[PDB]
Amino acid sequence: APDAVFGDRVRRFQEFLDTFTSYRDSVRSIQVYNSNNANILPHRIIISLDDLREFDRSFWSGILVEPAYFIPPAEKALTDLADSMDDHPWKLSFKGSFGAHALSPRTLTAQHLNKLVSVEGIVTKTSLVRPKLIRSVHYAAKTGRFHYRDYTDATTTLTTRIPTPAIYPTEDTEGNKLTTEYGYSTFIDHQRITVQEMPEMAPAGQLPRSIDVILDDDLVDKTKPGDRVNVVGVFKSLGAGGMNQSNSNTLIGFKTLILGNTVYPLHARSTGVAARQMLTDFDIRNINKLSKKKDIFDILSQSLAPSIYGHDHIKKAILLMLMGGVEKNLENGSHLRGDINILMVGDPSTAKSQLLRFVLNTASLAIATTGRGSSGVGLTAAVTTDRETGERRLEAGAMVLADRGVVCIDEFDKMTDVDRVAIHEVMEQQTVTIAKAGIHTTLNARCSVIAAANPVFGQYDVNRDPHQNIALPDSLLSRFDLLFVVTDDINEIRDRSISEHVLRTHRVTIPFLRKYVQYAKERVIPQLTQEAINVIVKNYTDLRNDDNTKKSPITARTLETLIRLATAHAKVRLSKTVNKVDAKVAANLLRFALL
Amino acid sequence: KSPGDNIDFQTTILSRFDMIFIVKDDHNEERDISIANHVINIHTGNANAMQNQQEENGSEISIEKMKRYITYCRLKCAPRLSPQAAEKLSSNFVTIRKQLLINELESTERSSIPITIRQLEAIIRITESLAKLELSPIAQERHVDEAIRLFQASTMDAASQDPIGG
Amino acid sequence: VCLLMGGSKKILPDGMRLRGDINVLLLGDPGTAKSQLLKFVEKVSPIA
Numbered sequence A: 001a002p003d004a005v006f007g008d009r010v011r012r013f014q015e016f017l018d019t020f021t022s023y024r025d026s027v028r029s030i031q032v033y034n035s036n037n038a039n040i041l042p043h044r045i046i047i048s049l050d051d052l053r054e055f056d057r058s059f060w061s062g063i064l065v066e067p068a069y070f071i072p073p074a075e076k077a078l079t080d081l082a083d084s085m086d087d088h089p090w091k092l093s094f095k096g097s098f099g100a101h102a103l104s105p106r107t108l109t110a111q112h113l114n115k116l117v118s119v120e121g122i123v124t125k126t127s128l129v130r131p132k133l134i135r136s137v138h139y140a141a142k143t144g145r146f147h148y149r150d151y152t153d154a155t156t157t158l159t160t161r162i163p164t165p166a167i168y169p170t171e172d173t174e175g176n177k178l179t180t181e182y183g184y185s186t187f188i189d190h191q192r193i194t195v196q197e198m199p200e201m202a203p204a205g206q207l208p209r210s211i212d213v214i215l216d217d218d219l220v221d222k223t224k225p226g227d228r229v230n231v232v233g234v235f236k237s238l239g240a241g242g243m244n245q246s247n248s249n250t251l252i253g254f255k256t257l258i259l260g261n262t263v264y265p266l267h268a269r270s271t272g273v274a275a276r277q278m279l280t281d282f283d284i285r286n287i288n289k290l291s292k293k294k295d296i297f298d299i300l301s302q303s304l305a306p307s308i309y310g311h312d313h314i315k316k317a318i319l320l321m322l323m324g325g326v327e328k329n330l331e332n333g334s335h336l337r338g339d340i341n342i343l344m345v346g347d348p349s350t351a352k353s354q355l356l357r358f359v360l361n362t363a364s365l366a367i368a369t370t371g372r373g374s375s376g377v378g379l380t381a382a383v384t385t386d387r388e389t390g391e392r393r394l395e396a397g398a399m400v401l402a403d404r405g406v407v408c409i410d411e412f413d414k415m416t417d418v419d420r421v422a423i424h425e426v427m428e429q430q431t432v433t434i435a436k437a438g439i440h441t442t443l444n445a446r447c448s449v450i451a452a453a454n455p456v457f458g459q460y461d462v463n464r465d466p467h468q469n470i471a472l473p474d475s476l477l478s479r480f481d482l483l484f485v486v487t488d489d490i491n492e493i494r495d496r497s498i499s500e501h502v503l504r505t506h507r508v509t510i511p512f513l514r515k516y517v518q519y520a521k522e523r524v525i526p527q528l529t530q531e532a533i534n535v536i537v538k539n540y541t542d543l544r545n546d547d548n549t550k551k552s553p554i555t556a557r558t559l560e561t562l563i564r565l566a567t568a569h570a571k572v573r574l575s576k577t578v579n580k581v582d583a584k585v586a587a588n589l590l591r592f593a594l595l
Numbered sequence B: 001k002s003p004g005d006n007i008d009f010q011t012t013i014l015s016r017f018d019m020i021f022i023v024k025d026d027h028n029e030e031r032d033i034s035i036a037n038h039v040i041n042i043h044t045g046n047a048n049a050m051q052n053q054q055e056e057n058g059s060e061i062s063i064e065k066m067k068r069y070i071t072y073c074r075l076k077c078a079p080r081l082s083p084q085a086a087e088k089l090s091s092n093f094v095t096i097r098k099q100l101l102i103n104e105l106e107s108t109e110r111s112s113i114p115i116t117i118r119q120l121e122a123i124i125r126i127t128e129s130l131a132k133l134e135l136s137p138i139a140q141e142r143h144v145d146e147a148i149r150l151f152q153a154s155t156m157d158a159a160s161q162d163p164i165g166g
Numbered sequence C: 001v002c003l004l005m006g007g008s009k010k011i012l013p014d015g016m017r018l019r020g021d022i023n024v025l026l027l028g029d030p031g032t033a034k035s036q037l038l039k040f041v042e043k044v045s046p047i048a
Ligand SMILES: Nc1ncnc2c1ncn2[C@@H]1O[C@H](COP(=O)(O)OP(=O)(O)O)[C@@H](O)[C@H]1O
Pocket: A307, A308, A309, A310, A347, A348, A349, A350, A351, A352, A353, A354, A355, A502, B117, B118
């Protein structure tokens, strides 16, 4: 029967929705979209705990400490507004500051039970998404009528209810047989996941802690194992901890878990979740303005790692790799690469690792590896595991995770042949092929590479040919688009200047660079122009038919590299076509790297 | 033989450290006698009381007190150089690299103990570390003097290298 | 002493880290008391 407290709380939350008008128009917009475009959006909105705090502290504290009594009223009020304003019940999500209620699996204890929490951690294992039967529909052949039944369980409501275990009906009330109508019944999706403490926050040498989270319907497949995640929900208990019946055993306790309602993926370094920023009109105006200056390439290049002295061409190359070219798919089924790769051979104090770590810190999706750190199955995802359902599955590796991203390799020359043969396919075919006992598949590995290497004799030697100084297979070098050699020669003026620079440090910002790169990569796709065609053809012919001793060979890969660099420079320019200047810049960079 | 030859790994590993100490065992009558006297004094038990129990009254610190003081200083202070120290460090670094270049061009071989930027930041860190224990948020040339003296005592014993000779 | 005290670290607007710790190597002949120094440093540092 009706309750007075429930109605008073519904009225108060309706007043709250009245005072703030953002959520109202959000609901209107969702309904408008679903009407016009029929894809169907789910019926849900997000509320800020901060605004609730300024509005009604009692209601705020009730939702924080007694969600089982205050949230269903709020959902009913929201549903009432939604039903009144239009020409499924609605649900809520929470953001803002949770204060003392923001915890981790280690610091979540029995004193937080029945309260709304927000946990952080790493996803370790998900489950198979299954349907759950809610309403069945049947047919009687003798009478020509249709029937139905409803089903419920303990996890579909926050407050405890008296069980009503209905049976599945096979007969009629008069004894006649029934037929199931699978198309007219209703099923809802269901999943269960596990969350652990972050590897970068848990104490060292200590076994970790974890907690289970239950998801339903429209939040069923929003994350994958290995992600950094933030989950907001109600920490809850179920059943009887051996209290009912004798149950002499006392070791077990009460089952606990989280009935989740909000899931947020978080970006970190060396992880599979990519960073994205929201672009406002001020940002777009500023970017489109800066696009029209003539030294834009120079400014964007000098912005990279301003703490390092010189290495301007390597900065330009890193920017070009960050932007990238365009990949081609022919109707026949062929694929043409569009990524850019960079290699660095240099002296042992040339700031190679600093630039490598900068690329790790700045790219939206990057994974860091070292020469002997990862090998075997750790690079190509060639490891196999299996479910407790029986099936064997694969789990992603370094380059499989970094699809559509970049990979940083340090101490490149310390690798072996077994993994170099593996990375050949990644760097050219951009695919990974596995053939083990009970598996035959092909995984996409479209990623770019940047690496740093050491000379054979500790320091680069000018009295010997490059082959005696690099000592890497020719077939491997052909797959690197650009190869740079850096040496430190003592010079009084250069030493002086670098000294004052390093002393200055010891006593365009990156976010705008990230916004710029994201917009340029998402929006612009230029095409080839005859002028650039002629320029690149001439340059390729001249390079292929010259007597100069080079740092790397010349093949068709060099021509494709010229095209890729030209297209990436045009992408930087925000132009929809490639001009002569982009081709000339690509040719100049290639010639400088080679000579 | 060069110090690079004396070690059993790539000579570029030596480029990573800030200060190097090649301690040799030279034979000497008086030094041997002094060290022997010290060691037998320690074993007998006089050094257990003498010095250690008398220097704790003003001119020596307890191990626990020193540990706590290191923790305190690490938490509290973080010095930063001054322009005079900066210019002096820059000039010294340039002179050192100039001398090494002259020596290398004087011959056909490369030295086994190279000088790089890492040594510049090494001297910077050393001067700041000396400043810190005094709790001074600022370091003056008096700290750079001692830093350069320590560097010359420790790292610039690369004069034992063959090209460095000159 | 300089090692235990440590230098000063700097975090830069571009994300680069200038470390503030000090590394030291000890070349020498046998029996010069260069292991007891390591043992004392281990016993006297708060974390070691
Ligand atoms: N061109 C440069 N500009 C500024 N600092 C430099 C430069 N080259 C070297 N350094 C300094 O020297 C150190 C070199 O470290 P690292 O990046 O490991 O070099 P490498 O990988 O070549 O050994 C860095 O800490 C950096 O501060």
